[PDB]
Amino acid sequence: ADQDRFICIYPAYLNNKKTIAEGRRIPISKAVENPTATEIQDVCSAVGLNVFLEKNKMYSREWNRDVQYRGRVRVQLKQEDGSLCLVQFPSRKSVMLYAAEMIPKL
RNA sequence: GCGGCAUCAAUAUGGUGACCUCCCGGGAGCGGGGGACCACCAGGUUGCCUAAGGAGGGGUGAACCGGCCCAGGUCGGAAACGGAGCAGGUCAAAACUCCCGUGCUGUA
Ligand SMILES: [K+]
Ligand SMILES: [Mg+2]
């Protein structure tokens, strides 16, 4: 439950524009074009998740130093005790697929 | 060796590299492992109604387009470390180009 134990979401995980080795985490059929951390958190937060922005972190695998291309997003799943904060997001993978599907909407 | 033209394919085994798609593990950088597909390679067969199909020797690789190894610096990290990768070094294997040889064909 300690922020230090929040999981990580780098936009690169979600970027349909990046190869596996550039860091893509979800299938292109679900991936998305150039999502930004902000977005990522902006969807998560408004789902009842606990999540904050590290606007300044920078994914390793990302030579470009442009902003649109940076920031990390921290999301708490389980409750210090051990329960997920929302039955619907067990896996980090679950989060990723969700974020990936709601952003197209904002 | 004067001028012309033209020079494999498909099979097995073991590399190299991309890419896609799934799990398991993790607070990052990540660890673990299953499939699919492409390109290139090694040297071993196989073959066609080849005119011949050696699987030859070089060079470029460079303002991102190659593979490796990567000083620095940079990003993740409390650190250990790890990633991405420039310079430089380097090469059985991105791609593009040079030398041959070799086979048929040739006519004044
Ligand atoms: K160091
Ligand atoms: Mg695999």
CA-CA distance, A80 to A20, in Å (whole number)? Answer: 32
Task: With residue A99 as reference, give the H or E element that holds it.
Answer: helix A92-102
Domain range list for chain A:
1-106
Q: CA-CA distance, A46 to A51, in Å (whole number)?
A: 10
Phi-psi region of A14 (alpha: psi -120 to 50; beta: other; left: phi over 0): alpha
Query: Which residues contact residue A53 at a Cβ distance below 8 angstroms, ignoring those fewer than 6 apart?
Result: A37, A38, A41, A71, A72, A73, A74
| Contact between the CB of A89 and strand B at under 7 Å | no
Report the structure determination method: X-ray
Question: What CATH class is the domain A1-106?
Answer: alpha beta
Q: In chain A, which residues from 17 to 76 place their CB closer than 7 Å to nucleic acid strand B?
A: 19-22, 24, 26-29, 56-61, 63, 74
Give CA–CA dist A40/A30, Å, rounded.
Answer: 14
The CA-CA-CA angle for residues A31, A32, A35, to 5°, reads 130
